[PDB]
Design a protein around this ligand. Structure first.
Ligand SMILES: OC[C@H]1O[C@@H](O[C@@H]2[C@@H](O)[C@H](O)[C@@H](CO)O[C@@H]2O)[C@H](O)[C@@H](O)[C@@H]1O
Ligand SMILES: OC[C@H]1O[C@@H](O[C@@H]2[C@@H](O)[C@H](O)[C@@H](CO)O[C@H]2O)[C@H](O)[C@@H](O)[C@@H]1O
Ligand SMILES: [Ca+2]
Ligand SMILES: [Ca+2]
Ligand SMILES: [Ca+2]
Lengths: 701, 706
């Protein structure tokens, strides 16, 4: 049932360390590789920077002819000699705080206007930001691939070489995210037009969905500016769908070019979204890869985890991210392509004692492999560093291969992993709770995000009150997921798109965090789920619209629900819990015919009900609660207990987090203390831990 | 020389604890007061909530006639019986996680639309957010004061009562700030018009400053929408000056009303600004009080500190805030009106082990008094909680008066303070570094802030490149102030407005973080400082404009500086430090006339020089650095060492923070470990080395006699 990497036909925990040969004294390459191997790491990972090896147009140096640290060939040879497998990442983009994000200075100087990503005004967003499908950019990218890919092909594991995986580019779309600015390059706008014609066929069909009044597709312009009209929302929603196709087109062109060199090893991509030590926006970024993941089962996505610290302040971020990657990529192991080791920024400390706990928490939270980023600090050669001379701090090794505090933490965690990996990789948690992942709520990187600082989406202007980013960030990520993890209830996440009814029926409860909009297919799926005997918890709204904000009341009508939206005090009572704070004045007030009222406004109007439908059960709450009070934990706890769902353990201290992982033979109990407090507690089936620390217990069943 | 509270003509450390009588079973009031007293606290502090005591319109209960916890009179009497002095805070606003911020439900339902803060379009911003100078709001506030102030007057210290201090309202502007929208109520509009007429006298004079073409004052309105022209910036700048006069009018009106009841006690106000455990926006909010602090010597401002954790991520916030309060209020002690105890919200933990370190660091960082907020947990009666039933968590006492973990941390800190207060209160740090506080860079709460919904200020639209908010957050607060604290260099902050040359000349260095604009008065002061023998460090720009973005080249001319602004790589070299990352592509390029070039762009153009001017020294850097790399700390250290300023101690671990406080008699060494690492290090005084071992997120205090 579990997905995991395999070596010598056994479950293998992928332990990789990032070591940038191009940033290290080549005399010490062997020393770095030996010290990495001595931690029990099996793999080393590196960029192969285009800028570093194509020193001038059509002048390539992979042999150190012009600088010893250009000797990629010798670095590959050293990986083989020190019996490390190799992950290679030749771009074209690498980011990696490298000048021009890894693009050659000569290329950027020489490219035309509209090789670059453009704002609505036709101006360059950034002198290092190309348009992915620029003919110029792909021409030069292909010429780079023409030189680096034969080297990679020769040394690939399919030729019994050390190279086991290759990453395509780096964090596709990360610059549309960081600037909020969409590419308006005329090439992209033309592709968007083709995308729309293909999707709707006639202007009458599009007009019918958008309520527009185009005489033809010729009158259709890429959406820009703030959303004032539902037609604007519609045009931006399809612009989001278009960018998912665009990115799939980009990664497909790179992959096809790569396969033409006979490279048959595993291809990878890496997911950004952590900032300031939380990952509440990472689900938006992973949503941008929805078309890649459905069209390329041979590309393994890994997470870029940057927790910065390890506390109750961010404990939920890594589990929610792991669970969502599992939802969107169920046929491949959950792993971290970049797994924080040291810190990218001197002023943001990364403590060994923090990261050691993060590493163990990551095993509790289902991680199956990782690449310590950065294992080895680097020194940027001759002004190639974006931000300073030094690349990372507080790593396992400094750029001269001196051991730092993190080295012993990584050695201890790696020794645990190697001792347990055969059993641990085949364990899962027992989730009786499923939480729905409705991807369209996440499709907002161009109109609403933590990094886009002028919001184009204001749902009040559209006659709506539930903003999908507020819903997915505060009610879902920091709310329900944080609350279940705090309460030590196992959950799984499931992608609701093309979702199999049979993959929902194994769970005792399905939780759906719903805005006022939800497509007919998902409304139908949830109707069928309850009618066939599923238990659905739904809030804060029964949806009444589809993704284009056109009437769709399938779930509402199938469940016999009637409501009026009414203003009341922020606080409600729910299951006898008084003073439950809710996010909105506006609440759904439900007709209670054939229903049990279980929630009430301050004026005793019914804002939640329970009902039987066919063989199933429905709980609807017409109000939005996150986790900002003890009442929120009580409410989540009462809801879970409606279907008699039990924690795996009774633990005397409710502030201790635990994860029970088991298979037929083995149990691991992970205890995690996310608090600045020495805690002593006891447990039993349904010990002292230092601050910010952990304890792992094994049971034979 | 130090400013501190006094009792019996001796230095006295103000130790208060917040205990909300209205959220505690009144049978347990005495037990809460006795346990607070037993920590060595001398004072107890509470809100008197309007909503709680005016139960219906013109129906008042201060005696527990309708609910026993309405017996304010009894709570006051118990404070006296238990030998605690009492701070009272009767609003009208209290916030305090209380429904409607403490205003009565009946009031908010009765008030007409013009009582409320309104947006650009005339819509109510929030149903609990009044316009401060609303006739209706101030009428109801006066009727609330008519009933609560006689009780406070009768129980003052001068009538042998326990009441020693009273807070006026609560964090003026905090509610506007958190809503993300500014007040365009018609009272604001009309008072603004009167302000502009009084300020400019004629439309010709306004037009000459703004470069506008208005025919009359009737064509001019309070600015709304984004800043597109310099004239819009000018309109908003005057709007910022107006809001400071507006907040002074509000507090003057409350204060005058209070004094009429024969209330002679110390009046206080409390400063907001911490959010998510840092305080980089607090200097903006304290800046909104500039006119209150210059007109009311008798109102003492205290800080509301909410660190949430104690680590390198936020180590610099409390020191910078304490230093900025001192700069704006130099004649009163630095103190915390709200000093985090427990957590206001269940999902944000407050660990006793963090807060104990915060309390010690606060002593290191010059705090002279505080009010533990919250000392006692409460339970909201009758659904009065804004957010839930329970008021605070992980406090010193639970609502029942059981001791929690934090109680022992507070007793330990207070014991040290009571043993040491007579010396410790009279100690200072030796600050050879002064940092300039230029308040107009902070005047952006209407146009640019972390909380404002609309970004109205885009300086590139005005032909500028140095954003005043970017400068004051990243170059000063998170940059220079953070770097100096991290490097263990003592600094003072001095307000440059009406600043005495004599109060700058005691320092070895004055550091000025400058934008492209600076008023004539400040340009002239810094010019005279250097000519008379001062050592000035100025970056990232020689200013060439005044506060209205009109030509002002006083400093540039007095310092004999020629420059051109040119684009280059973000990286510069400075004092032989390569690959110093800087915020902007645009840099000032100086010619080398009568100067030593000390910084170069990637094309080897001069972006920094060192010069002698009269008897003084000038170092100017034509580029912007905060603290985002090791090069930044190296550069700050090099600049400080230009005038041979030395740390008080050699410490073997650069990541240990220390403060040395001394007087005549005593030296205190504070060691602060803001890191999740057990650290074993040695130190010595910089004028045989002692070895110290310190836990994660911990502290050591050494006292020496002499
Ligand atoms: O910067 C570190 C490392 O991270 C990867 O990109 C980061 C991304 O994960 C993150 O969400 C954002 C915002 O915090 O910063 C970076 O984009 C990247 O693949 C690596 O090259 C970087 O070295
Ligand atoms: O919320 C806790 C207490 O804090 C004060 O107001 C804070 C303010 O200091 C802070 O900057 C903002 C954002 O974090 O939140 C406000 O609540 C109040 O004066 C107290 O009444 C309140 O209980
Ligand atoms: Ca799993
Ligand atoms: Ca019905
Ligand atoms: Ca001082």
């Amino acid at each position: 049932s579990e997905k995991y990497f395999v070596k010598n036909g056994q479950p293998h925990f992928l332990i990789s360390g990032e070591v940038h040969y191009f940033r290290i004294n080549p005399k010490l390459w062997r020393n770095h590789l030996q010290l990495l191997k001595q931690t029990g790491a099996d793999t080393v990972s590196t960029y192969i920077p285009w800028d570093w090896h194509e020193i001038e147009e059509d002048d390539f140096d992979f042999e150190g002819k012009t600088h010893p640290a250009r000797n990629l060939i010798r670095f590959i040879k050293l990986c083989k000699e020190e019996n490390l497998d190799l992950i290679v990442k030749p771009g074209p983009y690498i980011l990696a705080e490298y000048e021009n994000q890894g693009l050659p200075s000569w290329l950027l100087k020489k490219l035309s206007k509209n090789a670059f990503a453009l704002d609505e005004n036709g101006n360059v967003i950034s002198p290092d930001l190309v348009s992915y499908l620029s003919d110029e950019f792909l021409e030069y990218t292909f010429k780079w691939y023409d030189k680096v890919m034969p080297i990679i092909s020769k040394h690939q594991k399919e030729h019994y070489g050390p190279i086991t995986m290759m990453q395509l580019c780096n964090e596709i779309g990360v610059f549309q995210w960081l600037s909020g600015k969409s590419d308006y390059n005329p090439k992209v706008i033309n592709l968007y037009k083709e995308f729309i014609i293909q999707r709707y066929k006639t202007i009458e069909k599009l007009n019918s969905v958008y309520s527009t009044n185009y005489n033809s597709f010729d009158d259709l312009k890429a959406p820009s500016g703030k959303i004032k009209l539902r037609s604007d929302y519609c045009a931006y929603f399809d612009f989001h769908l278009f960018f998912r196709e665009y990115y799939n087109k980009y990664i497909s062109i790179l992959k096809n070019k790569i396969r033409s060199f006979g490279i048959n090893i595993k291809l990878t991509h890496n997911i950004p979204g952590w900032i300031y030590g939380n990952a509440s926006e990472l689900p938006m970024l992973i949503s941008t890869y929805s078309e890649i993941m459905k069209n390329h089962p041979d590309i393994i996505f890994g997470l870029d985890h940057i927790p910065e610290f390890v506390s109750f302040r961010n404990a939920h971020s890594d589990l929610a991210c792991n669970k969502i990657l599992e939802a969107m990529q169920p046929e491949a192991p959950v792993w971290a392509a970049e797994f924080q080791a040291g810190t990218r920024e001197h002023h943001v400390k990364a403590y060994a004692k923090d990261l050691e706990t993060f590493y163990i928490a990551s095993l509790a939270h289902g991680i199956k492999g990782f690449n310590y980023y950065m294992f080895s600090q680097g020194i940027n050669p001759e002004g190639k560093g974006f931000y300073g001379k030094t690349f990372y701090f507080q790593t396992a090794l400094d750029a001269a291969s001196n051991k730092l505090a993190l080295y012993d933490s990584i050695k201890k965690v790696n020794r645990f992993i190697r001792k347990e990996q055969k059993d641990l990789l085949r364990t899962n948690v027992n989730s009786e709770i499923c939480v729905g992942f409705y991807k369209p709520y996440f499709f907002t990187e161009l109109i609403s995000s933590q990094l886009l600082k002028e919001k184009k989406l204001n749902v009040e202007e559209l006659g709506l009150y539930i903003d999908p980013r507020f819903l997915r960030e505060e009610i879902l990520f920091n709310g329900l997921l944080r609350g279940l993890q705090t309460l030590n209830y196992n959950y799984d996440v499931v992608d609701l798109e093309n979702c199999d009814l049979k993959s929902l029926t194994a769970y005792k409860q399905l939780w759906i965090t719903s805005a006022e909009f939800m497509d007919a297919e998902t409304q139908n799926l949830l109707s069928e789920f309850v009618l066939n005997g599923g238990n659905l918890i739904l809030y804060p709204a029964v949806p009444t619209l589809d993704n284009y904000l056109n009437r769709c009341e399938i779930l509402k009508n199938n469940f016999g629900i009637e409501f009026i939206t009414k203003d009341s005090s922020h606080k409600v009572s729910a299951f006898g819990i008084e003073d439950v704070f809710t996010a909105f004045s506006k609440k759904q007030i439900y007709n209670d015919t054939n229903s049990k009222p279980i929630a009430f406004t301050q004026e005793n109007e019914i804002c939640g009900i329970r009902k039987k439908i066919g063989k199933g059960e429905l709980t609807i709450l017409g109000f939005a609660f996150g986790y900002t009070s003890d009442e929120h934990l009580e409410l989540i706890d009462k809801l879970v207990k409606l279907n008699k769902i039990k924690r795996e353990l009774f633990v005397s201290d409710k502030d201790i987090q635990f994860v029970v992982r088991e298979n037929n033979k083995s149990r691991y109990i992970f205890f995690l203390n996310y608090h600045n407090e020495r805690k002593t507690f006891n447990y039993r089936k349904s010990i002292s831990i230092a601050p910010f620390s952990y304890k792992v217990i094994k049971e034979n069943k």
